[PDB]
Amino acid sequence: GLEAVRKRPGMYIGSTSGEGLHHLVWEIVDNSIDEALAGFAKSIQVIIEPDDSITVIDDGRGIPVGIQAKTGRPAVETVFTVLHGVGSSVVNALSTSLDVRVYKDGKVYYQEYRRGAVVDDLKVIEETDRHGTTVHFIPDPEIFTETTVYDFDKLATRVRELAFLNRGLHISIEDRREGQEDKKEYHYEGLEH
Numbered sequence: 001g002l003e004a005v006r007k008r009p010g011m012y013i014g015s016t017s018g019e020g021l022h023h024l025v026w027e028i029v030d031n032s033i034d035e036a037l038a039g040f041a042k043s044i045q046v047i048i049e050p051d052d053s054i055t056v057i058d059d060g061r062g063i064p065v066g067i068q069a070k071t072g073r074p075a076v077e078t079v080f081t082v083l084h085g086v087g088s089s090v091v092n093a094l095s096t097s098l099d100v101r102v103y104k105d106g107k108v109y110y111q112e113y114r115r116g117a118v119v120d121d122l123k124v125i126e127e128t129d130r131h132g133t134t135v136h137f138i139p140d141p142e143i144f145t146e147t148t149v150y151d152f153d154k155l156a157t158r159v160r161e162l163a164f165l166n167r168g169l170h171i172s173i174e175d176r177r178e179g180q181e182d183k184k185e186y187h188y189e190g191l192e193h
């Protein structure tokens, strides 16, 4: 399974250089874009955290949390743990840690993984009035041996392109790193223009 991804990351993300590091962001963001395409997500936030980890927040329906007959596991766990808009488990495998929060039906469902391995069963941790999915991951320096430092301009350039290609979407990029905090928000208008 995912152990193959950790041993041959070049086959899954193309490169283990800075290019692969940035590719991880797109693998998660693309899933949020798919949920905007489905018609449910209206806004996506991408955040470079102070430690060069990444948080992606959308306001779509939330990844399904029900048990699948086929697997006996919650659908959300399978998304992150089974190799397959199909790249989430690759990002998981190539991260020291990934945590997912699903905001759905008034509850927050939470699961975390370490180098792709499940920490604990999906659990309800809070109540909520919002809906959507939040994925946070810390890229693995064992994999990304050249650099684990994000390029805000590189991310922002593509976020702007994604806003344009998905006209109507609100999408932002935020840098929370020391001495360089910044945020750019993009939204191209539809027929309301």
Ligand SMILES: CCc1[nH]c2nc(Sc3cnc4c(c3)N(O)C=CC4)nc(N3CC[C@@H](N)C3)c2c1Cl
Pocket (backbone or CB within 6 Å): 028, 029, 031, 032, 034, 035, 056, 057, 058, 060, 061, 062, 063, 064, 079, 085, 086, 088, 133, 134, 135
């Ligand atoms: C924050 C990133 C994100 N947001 C996400 N939001 C959703 S929301 C969603 C998607 N598909 C369905 C549903 C929600 N629901 O509620 C019912 C049937 C299908 N799904 C997700 N999945 C499901 C399959 C894969 N594309 C990743 C994601 C992912 Cl990953």
